[PDB]
Design a protein around this ligand. Structure first.
Ligand SMILES: Nc1ncnc2c1ncn2[C@@H]1O[C@H](COP(=O)(O)OP(=O)(O)OP(=O)(O)O)[C@@H](O)[C@H]1O
Ligand SMILES: [K+]
Lengths: 313, 322
């Protein structure tokens, strides 16, 4: 319960296949820092927010790369633990028509983070605890995530859950629904894509409304549903609407702004009862989010400034 | 026709880290896989037997074998595990990071062997990397015993890579068992010492132990230094060729490739190996060719891609002869 954003989960290497300079030459793969909560933590640090990444990294070359990446971005690293038991996970993405994937996970270093690896100081100082479903791919890591979410709540931190459901990372022939819903019931703020909304609806053999109502049965106070290129839809236990604008980028902007606006977890409640604030804050989160990506700040800079001017006038 | 060379074991991807978003270059690899490609490049009948993942890397290895002329009928696939990856970088020593134990090649089982492979096989070649766990090790031993009974010469290149073995476990036992089952053994100077150490003795003790098994020929290597050969009746050393190293990767496998290739071309059957081991003139002639293949490989980058054709090997021998 303070001002720090605690991002928990997996950090891994994205290996991007490069187009063949073709013939005789071995094809190349480019190394890039990846992991859902991992990139959000980096985005927040870049925006200037106070953030810590909590998770396990392998003691290998890649683990070192990820650790350094966090340090350079300004992400606090003392919550990070290491292991030689498993290698840092790898996410290979290549191209006959589109994207092809190959994940070296499980096993993986990030899957081995255990409850004893959490430090009480991280929770006491966290204003927000953020997680994704990738740290729920096996029974052990899932429970670890759930306990982290409960500890966060108990400590007075706002619990944020960005589903980021990636089926390919889940065990063959198993149903993720159960863990996804448990995770959803422990979050104060939930972020979903329109596709995940329909997926959840199906798991219920009902509609989007049934999902939203199910959500309100747990801890959830705010639901954000992003789209293809459409507006962001927000929902609370008392209302709903859409955010006019001019995925992950958004999440970073959102956590950064929430940390800047809320003094505590109670502030979220007042926020949810104020559609005007909701709209203004999310529109801003979306805008400032682009900055986590010399450069042009236009037309956004002018758009944001003119709005504030009109509102003050 | 019983002239096929059967290379059994692992086929994996070597990911070569490039100097400074860091780039990694995809290269076909694996000890027995390298040998197979070397043999195929020379024009010999060869088949790679092992399991490849049902992933992008497995497809790359399958196609690379096919393009090189390696028969693929003995390859089996699995989606249970990914194709092994061997990351090679620096830190200024050549560092290593493997994505194995968990890997496709380790899941090959006795049931995957095909009688037709052993029926046409004149030679069965294997390495210690397919001995990194109890299950795969048993499969390798069985392949070796099956080959011998089917009338194929059993070739074993130790190719000991400690990093791939489980922590705390002593690989000595398995290594010695594989060694006792081979007709032809290839070791590095270092491996000879390692083996000498496991016996608390010297190189001679190791050699005498080998003669207690099936071994009829032992080759001990080292870089540009002459390779030494030993049979139960004599020993000698063959000078190498003088070349400019560009990439020593897969040098030893190329050497093995040239040697096995020559065995298959010259031997009518497995029994011919005995007469061969009793004829130093032939041994020196054959090892010269093998040394030539190894020399031409080290001057070319990669492994699968660094293998020479027969005309090129013979040219080097012709030129650097007189
Ligand atoms: N610098 C060199 N000059 C000439 N020939 C070489 C050189 N390096 C290797 N070779 C040839 O290749 C054979 C392969 O040998 P080396 O002793 O380096 O094998 P190794 O260390 O077992 O290989 P690997 O890296 O596959 O384990 C040599 O005996 C030799 O004939
Ligand atoms: K080479």
């Amino acid at each position: 319960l303070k001002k720090t954003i605690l991002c928990f989960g997996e950090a891994l290497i994205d290996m991007l296949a490069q187009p063949l300079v073709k013939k005789g030459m071995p094809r190349a793969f480019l190394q890039c820092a990846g992991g859902a909560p991992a990139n959000v933590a980096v985005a927040v640090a870049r925006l200037g927010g106070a953030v810590q990444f909590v998770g396990m990294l392998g003691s290998d070359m890649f683990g070192d790369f990820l650790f350094d990446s966090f340090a350079e971005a300004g992400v606090v690293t003392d919550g990070i633990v290491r292991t030689s038991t498993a290698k840092t996970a790898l996410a290979f993405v290549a191209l006959h028509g589109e994207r092809s994937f190959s994940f070296y996970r499980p096993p993986a270093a990030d899957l081995l983070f255990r409850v004893e690896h959490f430090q009480d100081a991280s929770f006491s100082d966290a204003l927000i605890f953020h997680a994704c479903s990738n740290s729920m791919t096996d029974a052990d890591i899932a429970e670890v995530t759930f306990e982290g979410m409960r500890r966060a709540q108990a400590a007075g931190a706002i619990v944020s859950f960005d589903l980021n459901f990636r089926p390919m990372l889940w065990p063959n022939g198993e149903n993720p629904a159960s863990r996804l819903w448990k995770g959803l019931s422990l979050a104060d703020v939930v972020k979903l894509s329109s596709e995940e909304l329909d997926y959840l609806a199906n798991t219920l053999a009902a509609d989007a409304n049934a999902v939203i109502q199910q959500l309100w049965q747990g801890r959830a106070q705010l639901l954000l549903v992003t789209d293809a290129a459409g507006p962001v839809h927000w929902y609370t236990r008392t209302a709903g609407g859409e955010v006019p604008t001019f995925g992950d980028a958004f999440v970073g902007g959102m956590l950064y702004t929430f940390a800047q606006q809320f003094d505590d977890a109670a502030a979220l409640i007042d926020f949810c009862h104020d559609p005007e604030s909701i709209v203004s804050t999310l529109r801003f989160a979306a805008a400032v989010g682009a900055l986590a990506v010399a450069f042009t700040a236009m037309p956004m800079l002018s758009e944001v400034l003119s709005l504030i001017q009109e509102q003050s006038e």
